[PDB]
Symmetry: D2
Subunit: 428 residues, 4 copies
Amino acid sequence: EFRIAQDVVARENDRRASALKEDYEALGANLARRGVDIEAVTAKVEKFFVAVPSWGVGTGGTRFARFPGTGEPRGIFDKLDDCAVIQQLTRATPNVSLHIPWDKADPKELKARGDALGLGFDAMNSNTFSDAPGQAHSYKYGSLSHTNAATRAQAVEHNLECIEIGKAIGSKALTVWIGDGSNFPGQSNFTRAFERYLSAMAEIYKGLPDDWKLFSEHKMYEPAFYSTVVQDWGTNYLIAQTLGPKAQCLVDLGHHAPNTNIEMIVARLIQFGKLGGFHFNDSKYGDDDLDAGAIEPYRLFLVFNELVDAEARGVKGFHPAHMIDQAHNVTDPIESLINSANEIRRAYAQALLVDRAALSGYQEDNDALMATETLKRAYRTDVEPILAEARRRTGGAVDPVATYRASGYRARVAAERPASVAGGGGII
Amino acid sequence: EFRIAQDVVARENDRRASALKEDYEALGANLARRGVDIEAVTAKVEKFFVAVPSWGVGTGGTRFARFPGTGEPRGIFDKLDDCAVIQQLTRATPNVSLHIPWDKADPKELKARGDALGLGFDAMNSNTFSDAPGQAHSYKYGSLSHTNAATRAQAVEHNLECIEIGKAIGSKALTVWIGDGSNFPGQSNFTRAFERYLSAMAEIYKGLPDDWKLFSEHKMYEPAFYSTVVQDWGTNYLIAQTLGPKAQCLVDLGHHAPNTNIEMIVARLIQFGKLGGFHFNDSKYGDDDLDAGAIEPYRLFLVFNELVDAEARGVKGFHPAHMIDQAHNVTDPIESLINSANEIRRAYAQALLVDRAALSGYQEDNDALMATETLKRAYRTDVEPILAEARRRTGGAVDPVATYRASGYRARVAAERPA
Amino acid sequence: FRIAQDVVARENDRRASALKEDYEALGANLARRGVDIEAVTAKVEKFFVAVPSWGVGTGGTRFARFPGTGEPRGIFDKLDDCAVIQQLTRATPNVSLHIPWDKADPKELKARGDALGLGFDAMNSNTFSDAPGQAHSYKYGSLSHTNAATRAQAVEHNLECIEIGKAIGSKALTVWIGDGSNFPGQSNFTRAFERYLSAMAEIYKGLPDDWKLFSEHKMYEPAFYSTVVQDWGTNYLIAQTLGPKAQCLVDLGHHAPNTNIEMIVARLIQFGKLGGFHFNDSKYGDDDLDAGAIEPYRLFLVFNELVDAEARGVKGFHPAHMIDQAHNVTDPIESLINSANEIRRAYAQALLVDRAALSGYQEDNDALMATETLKRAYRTDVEPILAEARRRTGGAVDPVATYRASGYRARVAAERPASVA
Amino acid sequence: FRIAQDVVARENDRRASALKEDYEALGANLARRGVDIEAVTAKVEKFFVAVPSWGVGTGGTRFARFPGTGEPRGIFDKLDDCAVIQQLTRATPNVSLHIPWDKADPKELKARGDALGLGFDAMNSNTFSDAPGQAHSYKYGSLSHTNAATRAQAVEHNLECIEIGKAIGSKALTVWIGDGSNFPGQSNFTRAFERYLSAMAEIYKGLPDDWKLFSEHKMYEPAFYSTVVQDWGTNYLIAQTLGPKAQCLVDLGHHAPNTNIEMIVARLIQFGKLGGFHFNDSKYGDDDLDAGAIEPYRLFLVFNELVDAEARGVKGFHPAHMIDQAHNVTDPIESLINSANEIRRAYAQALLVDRAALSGYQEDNDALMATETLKRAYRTDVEPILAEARRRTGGAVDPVATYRASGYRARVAAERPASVA
Ligand SMILES: C[C@H](O)[C@H](O)[C@@H](O)[C@@H](O)C=O
Ligand SMILES: C[C@H](O)[C@H](O)[C@@H](O)[C@@H](O)C=O
Ligand SMILES: C[C@H](O)[C@H](O)[C@@H](O)[C@@H](O)C=O
Ligand SMILES: C[C@H](O)[C@H](O)[C@@H](O)[C@@H](O)C=O
Ligand SMILES: [Mn+2]
Ligand SMILES: [Mn+2]
Ligand SMILES: [Mn+2]
Ligand SMILES: [Mn+2]
Ligand SMILES: [Mn+2]
Ligand SMILES: [Mn+2]
Ligand SMILES: [Mn+2]
Ligand SMILES: [Mn+2]
């Protein structure tokens, strides 16, 4: 199937082919003068993939309000149809990340739809940070770390079910992010809550297939506003080290305290073999969940610099799961995910241009200026031509968003799906 | 009428009266040794009021979920009923802040219910940060500063309607907080957006009664995650100054950048006569909206220290509007508001204890250690006895939350209200 | 006696009546709450915190230093001044030394301490500044420097610190370094940390059987882009890697904005790697201000975690307590006195928490009453308890007022020549 | 010429070929985008930023200072090194002086500047440290000190800075003071500000008709609790109160974590009080790192506001641009060279933004395309433009490469005695 007509894609590509050939050739000549083979770079970029969040193709909101657009997806099936568009145009998001119970449905159908749309399934995501209809025990005061045994058992069961769904659809990991924490000093005993959490996670670990991974995701705050059980990478490391070989840490960019050196955390986790994966997005204030690289592109580049460095030195058993975790409140969710996936490949491609030998030399000589300039030479490079050519050669669009708007997809699905209504957030 | 049975109040007060007498007399003797008449302090404390937010009486939530408790208020009237309890027990929250359209209802009935419950109404709160049913233009991309004139006009009209409702119930002010801002660089032109906002606010100011005040509330971020039109007190000052004498700035404690010295902002606004009022709450990370003083009680004291100093310096015509703006996500909203109102009176009382003459002397002599110790001598003082006696003398409860739970009020409204 | 005993007695007697009234009033109030004030006073009078030799002299910033009068000339003057703090507060019996700043004949240092009634806490190494005759500069690092010879030099300095500490009665070595980078790319994060670990392993080998090696994390300064030992996570990795004798030291002002520090303390305790504390306060960065002068509640919450550990029955839990502050606009002696007092204050209030009631509220998820239970302790003015603890142990009811009445500062100002160049 | 002309020419010819290729390639791409590269280049070669005299020497922190070789001592050595930056970049024709650090016979300074081809930007007063023989200490403040005589002394000092500046070609005085408090209660926020305003009014009276008075806000350091001129809000009140000749100076690293600085820039421009900038980068506090070395996009976004201000033809808009950095681990000259380069880079890129398209996407609320319009400009590698601009104006294609090829550092190292061999 092709959510976007092939003629429109070919049409929009031909319209930009000339300019692209020029830019690509100019960049290739420049890279050559730098001892770099543009073709080698493009080949790797075509092979870089990042999972899209099923809950990301829908318009998001804040605790104050939600302003849905037209053609909002009704459920997992409409969401998969929209994710297909993203993959077809960018060719960078072949896999979708499911969230339960939001995307609960017959595993056979999900798999079927995915195969038909040319989409796979990444890590499963459990939900014990909200109450579902008919739920026996509320997660108001926590889940996996709740003081009530029955409540923890219920949370554990839910996570085990997520693993069962994932196995049936082709997933190989479970990501566990909970809101568990406290809003007031004294409300929670830090140590006892963590102990409860560890014990519950141990039960979940027991249900992991031999080739599966369990990712725990830390977050400084929100929904808890005083303390959070899994508040940072330090606690997260203790979790992973304690649970076992299959347990690793997931780093969501906007989940750190102000001014935190996030790329260092990535490096530390790689060093001790616990970098399970990433949740890409950008931010300026808190866990803003904005389009990747829209606020601080250099920081995104620096994270990838650590990723490529580890890749370069053959760090064996190094396959971090890459996923986008964003909320789109003022843009067409599909266009944002498209450009976000693009930005990620942009940062990856620039990281690949880093002269590793020269950098190592300046590091050993303590030539700070040249070391930092060596990274900038790669970062300053406009690799858009490589990103565009990679898409073109793999069946994607030179200009993804332009082709998307030219296709009229949004207007189309807007006519097929029921209207939505604005409203307030959880504030009241 | 009394939401809490008068016999329960008398009972729970008698049960703690002996202990209170002992603590009050001990504190009075200690203060007397420090040259302070405890009676003068209690007299002032029982006169300190802070308005309760109608939107804080029901359980709050986040973008991730809402976990309502039992007996949740069904509307503004249930909310007023619950606010009546807060006032009856603490005697520090005689006024309620309404939010339109959330609390829209016959103004005449609101006033009636208010008078019967012994409650009054503080500043009105406009809402152009969310869309209402049948709304012609969406506020998705802004409201008062939206690029579309028709949208801006609609936002202006809404605020004017808020003023009409407030005039009917006895409100004397309009508080304007909007989410207007951008999530991406370039999305908005900082200056043009601000110019649009100023022009729209000028229209609202034009329709403001001459016995009313117009409060603009700054916020660093959320719902906007890259830029916000009214992002800080600097922009807020420019707004108030531009609009006119009736326009002032409202300071919400959790709306500042990390590590910001908020008590200084308060002092600066007072000096330039633009401190319209406060939205009290506490926080640790962002605009957490937690129970006031639950996280950083000293900071609360330091804010009140600037308020009391303003009086001591002789600043005139200074009557800030005091209001609580909190979200109660994991506690009984009534209990949180009760203890929050209490914490605010606590900080106020301690600020009244500061030996101003001594402090002044240490400041002039640059004796930093004794100057800070002078503030600490006041802050370290446990004024709970003064707060409890104040409540007792004015019809409240020695221990509000204890009396509240003894009343079984929550179970009662839980039975009267749906699930 | 640094401070004349008649001065202390006179000042104590002047305030005796008021202390009696306040203490007995507090005692009755606590009794009504089921707490024995005498039991609290008995524990308070035994809570000690080490005073930093480097904080007895006036501090400064990169912009300027404004010395006061009678600045101590060397380590001996500093010990003399520390003796004043201990005599008046009775809460600072031990001094933390810094090498090479306080380098001197161990026997002389020991003798002076004994004569003044002072002991010595953990030693502190210095490889964040260059000393004269140094073969290699620490400009680009020390224990993690790319140059092997530079690292070896840093290792030998730490071993020397241990030798000095052993001779004077110390039982630990605290290691804080500025190692890090100011530009992206300057350092390879993983290799720099590996170099550090290798060097610390060597230092670890020189530790006596009853010693401890404390590593201190810091988010930034002097490094402004990355720091090798940047946070508690990296710190935990260090202690766990080095061995049983290695633990983490938590300096309150070394964390990112809004960090929940008390949780970090709880985590380290759970995994037995909480070596000790560097107490101070701050509002912006590593401000190094007088403990509790900015956020007294936070200080109380850290102690709440320390007391809960004891309540939970954590075994062999003896964290080292030290003050690490810089006094740029006050008399250092007066600030250290009141800071030590704030520390005992927070400790005393933490002892007042009704743990039985708290555990009940935590189990029932009664967040409001749980927090109020903490507040009922924190709101209690324990000054009378601190004052009585001092009176009973030979200290001053009001330390700073007594210090000022003694005229000590004016005395040492006349005895000590201020530096000219 | 500090750098031999044959060296400059040689290093240029070595890179001339590749540059021609890149400049032509960028010119074609820009043409396809409706942009004339020549128009950009013409503006870029005219963009200047003043170099801080206190920036050519190696910097340090409160913990240590690690000087490099050939450290410039005195204003004459410093002007000599600044000349190198100007010769190679052609973007720093003016130097910012700091009194009393750079005190010297005005006529001799003017003479040295003209000989080196350097002018002088805003004068910088210093009342955040004490000079020998000073009558009153600034320990507790200067312009806002509680002591009248101390304020008068500070005021007189600034006036002297204006006299020195008038004699050498300066047209502005920048005032940054450390004035503030480290403890709650220490200062009365309002009285301190009142005193500051009164003193600044006296300085303002000494300003010639064509002079400007810049006040610089700073959140913290040296004051760690409160600072009189803590932010742009207070700064605006100052400028508005003093008069038309008074404006606000924005130092990028003086803001609270996560602050939207470009918005502050826009607000000040709207109200005619954006006096100038102090460029530098940072990640934690006022790190004073090489401009754009940490967050180059933020720098671009600041220049986006600057370029748009001109595009709108705002009145009273003519900001002074200065670099205010500290180089603790690099050759100061090289850092200043590359920092000045980054500033021009951001400027060039902001010049590339399609204002018409941007304005269109803003009106339609097409946030995605709006931000992409900024990115299209930002993602554009303008190095070819910067290099050509330098080549056409007598500068070096690759400034740092040419600097190293000249062996200048080793040269001054042989002429200037270090403290130790
Ligand atoms: C929906 C998803 O579980 C969620 O975004 C988490 O991954 C975490 O980012 C929350 O802050
Ligand atoms: C509900 C109320 O309008 C709201 O809380 C505003 O005042 C502001 O605090 C929001 O962040
Ligand atoms: C002097 C002492 O080594 C130093 O203060 C360290 O302990 C650490 O606090 C530095 O920021
Ligand atoms: C040296 C110069 O006066 C100084 O850097 C000020 O401009 C300010 O940036 C300090 O933090
Ligand atoms: Mn996530
Ligand atoms: Mn998140
Ligand atoms: Mn508010
Ligand atoms: Mn708010
Ligand atoms: Mn320390
Ligand atoms: Mn420190
Ligand atoms: Mn500056
Ligand atoms: Mn600065």
